[PDB]
Amino acid sequence: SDVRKVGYLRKPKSMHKRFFVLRAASEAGGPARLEYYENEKKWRHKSSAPKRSIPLESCFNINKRADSKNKHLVALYTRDEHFAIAADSEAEQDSWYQALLQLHAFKEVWQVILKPKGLGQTKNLIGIYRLCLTSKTISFVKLNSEAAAVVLQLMNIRRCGHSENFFFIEVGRSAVTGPGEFWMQVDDSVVAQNMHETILEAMRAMSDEF
Amino acid sequence: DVRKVGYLRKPKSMHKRFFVLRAASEAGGPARLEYYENEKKWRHKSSAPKRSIPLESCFNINKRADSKNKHLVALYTRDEHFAIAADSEAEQDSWYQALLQLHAFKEVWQVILKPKGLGQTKNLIGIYRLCLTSKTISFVKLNSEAAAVVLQLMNIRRCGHSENFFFIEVGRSAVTGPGEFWMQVDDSVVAQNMHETILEAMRAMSD
Secondary structure, three states, X not given: OOEEEEEEEEOOOOOOEEEEEEEOOEOOOEOOEEEEEOOHHHHHXXXXXXXXXXXXXXXXXXXXXXOOOOOOEEEEEEOOOEEEEEOOOHHHHHXXXXXXXXXXXXXXXXXXXXXXXXXXXXXXXXXXXXXXXXXXXXXXXXXXXXXXXXXXXXXXEEEEEEEOOEEEEEEOOOOOOOOEEEEEEOOOHHHHHHHHHHHHHHHHHHHHOO | OXXXXXXXXXXXXXXXXXXXXXXXXXXXXXXXXXEEOOHHHHHOOOOOOOEEEEHHHEEEEEEEOOOOOOOEEEEEEOOOEEXXXXXXXXXXXXXXXXXXXXXXXXXXXXXXXXXXXXXXXXXXXXXXXXXXXXXXXXXXXXXXXXXXXXXXXXXXXXXXXXXXXXXXXXXXXXXXXXXXXXEEOOOHHHHHHHHHHHHHHHHHHHO
């Protein structure tokens, strides 16, 4: 009856304990949504509105993440933002992640900051975009947008790399954008490194397809 | 019949030997690279060349470089790899072009296929020749004329080097199945270079 999962989880930034509440869809209470309150008392006593109430139907992607600060993140990607919650363990991270999918496209999704360097300036793709990875392509979807600015084939990426909290993608002449690099900033060197390893692995995994 | 002449060093012993390039003649013999103890022996026709390698037997000729010699010109025949060390990039190029003028693969490296991984499993051990084209990598056992295996560049997952070693890990789509070929080379300078050259070959495919 409404509440599927409940518990204290941390906000990745300020790292404050907030009491989260996952609720199933109902014809009275409202849609499937993830909410959080200042603490548990305010929820129990119905003495406050949730500080945030995110509908699951608006989340196009849900992933388990990690950075230099928080080892067990669970990230939600809607058309307008990236909402993350910091679990205290891999076990807890998976429970929430699993609960969310139980009530809720791309293999991976990363929110990045496309710099004006290289193809950034030449193709005018700067600011906040979402790097969406499949088994065969990488798309750059602008924040607040539902359609892709550009789709790159994994086959056309000559190389990719990272330096500090930056990550780049060099595409060959056979790419839709022509040759050039795509530079983008991320939270820290940890996430920049995972971005590199995951995409590279997806590049290498192509030789495994018959 | 003499096309080019001069002192070069034997890469191994670093001895100074007098090399003579000869065009084919219907009297003196076929196009060939030969060398003498010194110039006097060649001028005075008082000695047989220490070596006489016919060009028609060289399937590939390459400019090379390792930790000991920076300007090598290598000849690859069915049975051996013969390298000459020049004293500069200019001289290496001069000889390289002359040899080509009288004379398949973009690159050819002779390697020591180790019994690690796909080496033992496919019984590809010992001296082989890694032959690189723009789209493939072929392994030709020394003394042989046909390639043991032909790897499509698209099938390689990753290649790298460690010390004087170089590996190639292929994917499932490989004709040999997944796994890795380990091969030893002269030094780290050559392993690194194979890595780069080949890697660029993998990346250049997206162009």
